[PDB]
C-alpha cells in the first residue's frame, strides 16, 4: 500500500490550546503531546492536547520525567476521554516552520511505533495579526527515493494552495519529508458559543448621549467641510478646453469630490438619522 | 576553540572565555579524562 493526498482534522479547542501554550513561554521553545483517532484509512482527527514538564531553553527542549505522562492518561480515562496519543507538536519562536535534524531522530521512534503519527510545528510570533503559521509533516525513507518510486499517489485535490515556501524548500522538503493538508472541522454547537457571543449587548441598543458630545461633533465636521467645498470649487473652475486624459496625466492626489467630499456626507447622515430615530422610539416605549 | 583562565580544582566547574564573547562556566565531556586538562591552554568547545 502507499499514501495519497489525505487530511488532518483538528478541533477548535485544540487550536486554542496550542496557540495559548506556545505564546506563554515566548522566549523559549515548548512541546507537547496530542490525542485523537485514526478514524479511517486516510484521515486523522486530533481532539485534545496537554503539556508536560520540560527543561526549556532558547533553542531546544527536553521532557523531564515520564511518570507524569503515564499518570495523566489514566486520570483522563475515568472522566470520559479514552483516546490514546496520535502525535506530538512543538514550536519555533522566530524562525520558519520546518524540521531540524534532531526532530528526525525523535520522529523515527514514533513512526517505528505507530505507522501514521504526524508531527506538528507552530510559530507563535509570525502569527501576529490575522493568520496562523501552523503545519504538519511526515518523514520519507531514504532508500525509496533512490529507487524510481516517488513518495505518494495522486488525485486532483492535491494542488490547491499547497505551494511550499522557499524557506522550507531550502531544508529537507521532499528530499526528507512531506507536508499534509490541514483543515478545521468546527462542528455545530461550538459554532454558536463564538459567533453569537464574543460581541453582544442588550440595553445598549437604547442609549442617547444627547449632550454637547453630539453638537460639538456636528460643528466640527460641517466646519471643515466648508473648506473642502471651497477647495473643490477652485479645483473645478479651470474649465480648460483640454481632454480628461490630460486630467489623468496631472492627477496625483486630493481628488476633492471622491477623496473627501462624500465620506463626510455619509458620516453626518448616519449619525443624525440614527439619533433622531432612537429618540422617537423612546418617546413611545416609556409612557 | 577558546581558552581557559581559572580551573576550579576538586570542584568540577570550569570557567572559559572566548576572548570575543563573554565568560561562561562550563564542564568537561563524557570521554575526556579530567587529569590532562591543565589550566591555561586552548580547548575545543561544543557550539551548544
Amino acid at each position: 500500500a502507499v499514501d495519497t493526498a489525505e487530511q488532518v482534522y483538528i478541533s477548535s479547542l485544540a487550536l486554542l490550546k496550542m496557540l495559548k501554550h506556545g505564546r506563554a513561554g515566548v522566549p523559549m521553545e515548548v512541546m507537547g503531546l496530542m490525542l485523537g483517532e485514526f478514524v479511517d484509512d486516510y484521515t486523522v482527527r486530533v481532539i485534545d492536547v496537554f503539556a508536560m514538564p520540560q527543561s526549556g531553553t532558547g533553542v531546544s527542549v527536553e521532557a523531564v520525567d515520564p511518570v507524569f505522562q503515564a499518570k495523566m492518561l489514566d486520570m483522563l480515562k475515568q472522566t470520559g476521554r479514552p483516546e490514546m496519543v496520535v502525535g506530538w507538536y512543538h514550536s519555533h519562536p522566530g524562525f520558519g516552520c520546518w524540521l531540524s535534524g534532531v526532530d528526525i531522530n525523535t520522529q523515527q521512534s514514533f513512526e517505528a511505533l505507530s505507522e501514521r503519527a504526524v508531527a506538528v510545528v507552530v510559530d507563535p510570533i509570525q502569527s501576529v495579526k490575522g493568520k496562523v503559521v501552523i503545519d504538519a509533516f511526515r518523514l520519507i525513507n531514504a532508500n525509496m527515493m533512490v529507487l524510481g518510486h516517488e513518495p505518494r499517489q495522486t488525485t486532483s485535490n492535491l494542488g490547491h494552495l499547497n505551494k511550499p515556501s522557499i524557506q522550507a524548500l531550502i531544508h529537507g522538503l521532499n528530499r526528507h519529508y512531506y507536508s499534509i493538508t490541514i483543515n478545521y472541522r468546527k462542528n455545530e454547537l461550538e459554532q454558536k458559543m463564538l459567533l453569537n457571543l464574543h460581541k453582544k449587548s442588550w440595553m445598549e441598543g437604547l442609549t442617547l448621549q444627547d449632550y454637547s458630545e453630539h453638537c460639538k461633533h456636528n460643528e466640527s465636521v460641517v466646519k471643515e467641510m466648508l473648506e473642502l467645498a471651497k477647495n473643490y470649487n477652485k479645483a473645478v473652475e479651470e474649465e480648460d478646453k483640454m481632454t480628461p486624459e490630460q486630467l489623468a496625466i496631472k492627477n496625483v492626489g486630493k481628488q476633492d469630490p471622491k477623496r473627501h467630499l462624500e465620506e463626510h456626507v455619509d458620516v453626518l447622515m448616519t449619525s443624525n438619522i440614527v439619533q433622531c430615530l432612537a429618540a422617537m422610539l423612546d418617546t413611545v416605549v416609556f409612557k | 576553540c577558546t581558552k581557559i583562565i581559572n580551573a576550579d580544582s576538586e570542584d568540577p566547574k570550569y570557567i572559559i572565555n572566548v576572548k570575543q564573547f563573554a565568560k561562561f562556566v562550563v564542564d568537561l565531556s563524557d570521554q575526556v579524562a579530567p587529569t590532562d586538562i591543565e589550566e591555561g591552554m586552548r580547548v575545543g568547545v561544543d557550539r551548544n
Partner: peptide, 26 residues
C-alpha cells in the same frame, strides 16, 4: 600653542549573533 588638530578612528567590533545549528546526526 592653539589646536586645530584631527584624529583617526578604530572600528566597532561587536557584530556577531548566534544562529540555529542544523547538524544531522542519527
Amino acid at each position: 600653542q592653539p589646536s586645530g588638530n584631527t584624529s583617526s578612528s578604530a572600528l566597532m567590533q561587536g557584530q556577531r549573533a548566534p544562529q540555529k545549528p542544523s547538524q544531522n546526526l542519527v
